Amino acid sequence: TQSYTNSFTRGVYYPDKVFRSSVLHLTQDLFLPFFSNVTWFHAISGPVLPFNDGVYFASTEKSNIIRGWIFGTTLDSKTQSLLIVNNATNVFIKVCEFQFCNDPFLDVESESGVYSSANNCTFEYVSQPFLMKNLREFVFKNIDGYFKIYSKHTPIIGRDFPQGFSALEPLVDLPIGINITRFQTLLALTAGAADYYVGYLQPRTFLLKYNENGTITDAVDCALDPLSETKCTLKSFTVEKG
């Protein structure tokens, strides 16, 4: 099932590790435009989800059936594909070519239920798993080969998409460069339902605000409405009459 909901003012992450104090720094980078369309995939029991320069992901279910992601070009044994599985104890990262299975899924816990075979697979990396009423936000983008994942865990209210402001801190990075064109989530599995949101990132310009502690508190999306353009031109959050 598919629907549409307003993106509101969510999807802001720290662009770097540079400390700033009481600054209104203006950054030009990839972000999620304010008040956009996010495809709400809810109650799917059993798609494609084409991958671009940047994507978005958020979920709040406690069923733990949502885990892992697949990246690649054709999802075939003729082209290398990046498979990431964040299971309970660690995370699996590998670059391998295979025909996969009938449907890539974790046979609850046979990882062979996703991939059928392997090829030249010199690279293999294992790290701390991402898992550690609540809302989980993630940002997956691949720039100049480097794979960056930003995440944050916040206590949600209810089960619908809430409001408010919260910035995402970077967690991991990896310099593995391969042709990535399509991505698809993984479900471990008798019927059921699941809910998650997908957004697309575009190159925009923002006006971040750092408090005295260096924490992001507010942002302004330039080129959205004339007031935002005025604020970005003045580099201020309050405008006098004129």
């Binding site: 590790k17 540079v18 400390f19 600054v23 801190e169």
Partner: protein, 49 residues
């Protein structure tokens, strides 16, 4: 911040840095500089300055 180590002033210059070995916060200040002025009466009066 736990993941931040660099510093930045109002515009473009570093003013803080974190010690790579131990978790320390310390500033950076450029070494002193300035102009030099000479005070003197006329050479028809004296030669000390």
């Amino acid at each position: 911040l736990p993941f931040q180590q660099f510093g930045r002033d109002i515009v473009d210059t570093t003013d803080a840095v974190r010690d790579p070995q131990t978790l320390e916060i310390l500033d950076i200040t450029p070494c002193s500089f300035g102009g030099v002025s000479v005070i003197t009466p006329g050479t028809n009066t004296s030669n000390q300055v």
